[PDB]
């Protein structure tokens, strides 16, 4: 047997769209769709470590402030500013959260259903952002959690149609 395709560093190393994008977006890996490939295999772990590569389709210059920087630091070019090329901008970001590893479920709060505001990879700003893709590099997952398959109402099995070359 050859389990190279079930590797945790291989299956999570692909681009995934983040549906909610704003002019000023805070990059959170929890904003991925819960039923996607990487989205669900991420919800299937309690703590995750990863770098990040983003493909952003924007208008104007894109500024990226690291985690913990004030919101007012997004209006200055001292923070990494990428000038927009023709198709889009493809960057590689580091991990900037103070915690050793991030988490997908938090049991409680952090201020003296909603993860702490410190669980993010930074922020990005432009005049607007049309699409945003995130790619996890050298991802590591900890403490597996239940992973759910699709339910079947009354038929014996889930009947999905496979691609067929039938003429």
């Amino acid at each position: 047997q050859r389990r190279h395709h079930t590797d945790v560093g291989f299956i999570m190393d692909r681009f995934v769209k983040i549906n909610n994008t704003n002019p000023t977006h805070v990059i959170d890996l929890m904003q991925t769709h819960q039923h996607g490939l990487v989205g669900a295999l991420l919800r299937a772990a309690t703590y995750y470590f990863s770098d990040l590569e983003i493909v952003v389709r924007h208008e104007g210059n894109l500024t990226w402030v690291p985690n913990g920087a004030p919101e007012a630091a997004l209006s200055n070019a001292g923070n990494p500013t990428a000038y927009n090329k023709a198709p889009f901008t493809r960057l590689a970001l580091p991990y900037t959260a103070p915690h050793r590893v991030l988490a997908t479920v938090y049991n409680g709060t952090s201020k003296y259903t909603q993860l702490p505001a410190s669980f993010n990879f930074g922020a990005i700003r432009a005049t607007d952002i049309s699409e945003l893709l995130v790619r996890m590099k050298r991802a590591e997952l900890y403490c597996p959690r239940p992973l759910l398959a699709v339910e079947v109402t009354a038929q014996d099995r889930h009947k999905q149609k496979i691609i067929a070359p039938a003429k």
Partner: protein, 221 residues
């Protein structure tokens, strides 16, 4: 002069799974160490092997109760990763994102009945052969099967062999191809003593040589 290059046509597009890295934007950042962090898994099939999970029987319960009837067939379920009896299984949760698979699948049986009640059980596997599985408790002695009695050790594992035509099999049972896709497993009760409501919980784990092949994104988003 300088290096002459040929800007090839058809290359250079973004593919959401290309193996090339991006240009760093914020260099020389050292993250906090995460050495010997408890509970790290590098392969989804390693945790599939490690922890078996329960099946979902009729009415939605992880165990089969003894039936006080002439029917000696307690339960019967298809051996597939997209079935009813495997709907709430972690193995199905992994396999829903892969197109093909191959290898052994293990079934683990646990008895949760009272000690003063004794029973004998037999499990049989039927490959995609006969049009009707051997519902008769003796007709099923001719296929691959194993038996175990109840005692102090209420745990017993049964390995479902991988039999099929192709080298690899689909994890995605087709809308076509009616009748038995490949296989069903039947549980038989050889005898029972004073067992009217005694239960038997069935769990399934990936085999030692199980393997999933082609990552896909099949769910509607």
């Amino acid at each position: 002069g300088i290096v002459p290059v040929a800007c090839s046509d058809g290359y250079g597009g973004l593919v959401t799974t290309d193996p090339k890295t991006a240009d760093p934007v914020y260099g020389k950042v050292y993250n906090p160490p995460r050495t010997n962090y408890p509970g790290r898994f590098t392969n989804l099939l390693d945790v599939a092997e490690a922890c078996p999970t329960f099946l979902c029987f009729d009415d939605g319960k992880p165990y089969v109760v003894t039936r006080e009837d002439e029917q000696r067939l307690l339960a019967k379920f298809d051996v597939s990763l997209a079935a009813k009896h495997m709907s709430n299984t972690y193995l199905s949760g992994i396999a829903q994102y892969y197109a093909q698979y191959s290898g052994t699948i293990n079934l683990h049986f646990m008895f949760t009945g009272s000690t003063d009640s004794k029973a004998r059980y037999m499990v049989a596997y039927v490959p995609p052969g006969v049009e009707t599985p051997p519902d008769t408790p003796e007709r099923a002695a001719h296929c691959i099967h194993a038996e175990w009695d109840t005692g102090l050790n209420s745990k017993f594992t049964f390995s479902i062999p991988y039999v099929s035509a192709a080298d690899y099999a689909y994890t995605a049972s087709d809308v076509a191809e009616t009748t038995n896709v490949q296989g069903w497993v039947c549980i038989y009760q050889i005898t029972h003593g004073k067992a009217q409501n005694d239960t038997l919980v069935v769990s399934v784990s990936a085999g030692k040589d199980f393997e999933l092949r082609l990552p896909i994104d099949p769910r509607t988003q």
